[PDB]
Amino acid sequence: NLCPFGEVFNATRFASVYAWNRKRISNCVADYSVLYNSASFSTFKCYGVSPTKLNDLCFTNVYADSFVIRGDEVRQIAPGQTGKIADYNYKLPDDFTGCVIAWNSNNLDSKVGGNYNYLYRLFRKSNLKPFERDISTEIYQAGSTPCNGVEGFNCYFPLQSYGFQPTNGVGYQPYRVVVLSFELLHAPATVCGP
Amino acid sequence: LQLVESGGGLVQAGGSMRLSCAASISFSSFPMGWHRQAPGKQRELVAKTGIGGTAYDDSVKGRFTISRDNTKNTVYLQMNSLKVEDTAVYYCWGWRMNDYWGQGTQVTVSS
């Protein structure tokens, strides 16, 4: 009946941004006002839809993409952005319709001695297409000499860890992000407001 | 294996020794450190270091010192004031998506 927003927003662990999660939400009633009052969100904006009108709308499905990035990178989760995250990890289209929601998760995702579980992709041959996911771990050839499985200068394992520790500056602290895509198909709606 | 240990052996209580470890893969932004397993006991952390910080087991604080050369992807464990309890198999360790372990090096401290 009620949409399982808790499974996404309150998951004990989030995905690394390079392997960002997508949860298909269907056949349920969604109260986005309650969701807005669910926590102390630092980001809760929408594109192509009005936030305060979400409870009046019906969608065919809703897709919740979720991941962790550092604070300074939240700005990249938006149309028309560039940077390591937008280029190589998670890319929204220029005509994105949906909502971006982000909150500081330093209390959940940082640990003394470092939490290294959250990773990001630092190198890639080309930029991701919108909503593309790349989970490959092939050695990146940044130079003219082929790597052939050997790591070294200009031959990089393409993922790096955030290594969140609890006293990082806020720009280097972990932020959990949920991007809600509201799918409109020429089919009966399955996700409506109250 | 990706982690190659060196050092170890037999020492008297109060003595010292130094363990070394070289990785053939890059642990840049990832942790490297040392674990140990006494006979009939569970393998436990000794020390680790990385961009996330440096942590020691309570029993070795003030006696063991971990260091790391990021350029060579090497990690070291200076073991001072060795105690009989410090006798164990010591493993070089890293984490990069999965755990990486060295071969295991016997350290024996007797009086």
Author numbering:
A (entry chain A): 334 to 527
B (entry chain B): 2 to 112
Paper text:
Similar to other coronaviruses, SARS-CoV-2 utilizes its surface-located trimeric spike (S) protein to recognize the host cell receptor/(s) and further trigger membrane fusion, subsequently establishing infection. VHH antibodies, or nanobodies, are the antigen binding fragment of heavy-chain-only antibodies derived from camelids and cartilaginous fish. In this study, we report the identification and characterization of a potent SARS-CoV-2 neutralizing nanobody that targets the viral spike receptor-binding domain (S-RBD).
In order to learn the interactive binding mode between Nb-007 and S-RBD in detail, we determined the crystal structure of Nb-007/S-RBD complex at 2.0-Å resolution. The complex structure contains one Nb-007 nanobody bound to a single S-RBD molecule in the asymmetric unit. In the solved structure, S-RBD represents as two-structural-entity assemblies, which are composed of a conserved core subdomain and a canonical external subdomain. The Nb-007 nanobody utilizes its three CDRs to interact with S-RBD, obliquely inserting the CDR loops into the large concave depression in the external subdomain of S-RBD. These numerous engagements involve residues of Nb-007: I26-S27 and S29-P32 in CDR1, K49 in the nanobody framework-region, G51-G54 in CDR2, and W96-M98 in CDR3, interacting with amino acids of S-RBD: Y351 in the core subdomain and G446-G447, Y449-N450, L452, T470, E484, F490, L492-G496 and Q498 in the external subdomain. In addition, a total of eight strong hydrophilic interactions (hydrogen bonds and salt bridges), which are mediated by Nb-007-S27 with S-RBD-E484, S29 with Q493, S30 with S494, I52 with Q498, G53 with Y449, and R97 with E484, respectively, were observed to further stabilize the nanobody/S-RBD engagement. We found that the epitope of S-RBD that Nb-007 binds to mostly matched the RBS-C interface and should therefore be assigned to this group. Of the 15-residue footprint for Nb-007 and the 19-amino-acid footprint for ACE2, the interfaces covering residues G446, Y449, F490, Q493, G496, and Q498 are overlapping. The structural superimposition revealed that, unlike ACE2, Nb-007 could bind S-RBD of both up and down conformations without obvious steric hindrance with other spike protomers.
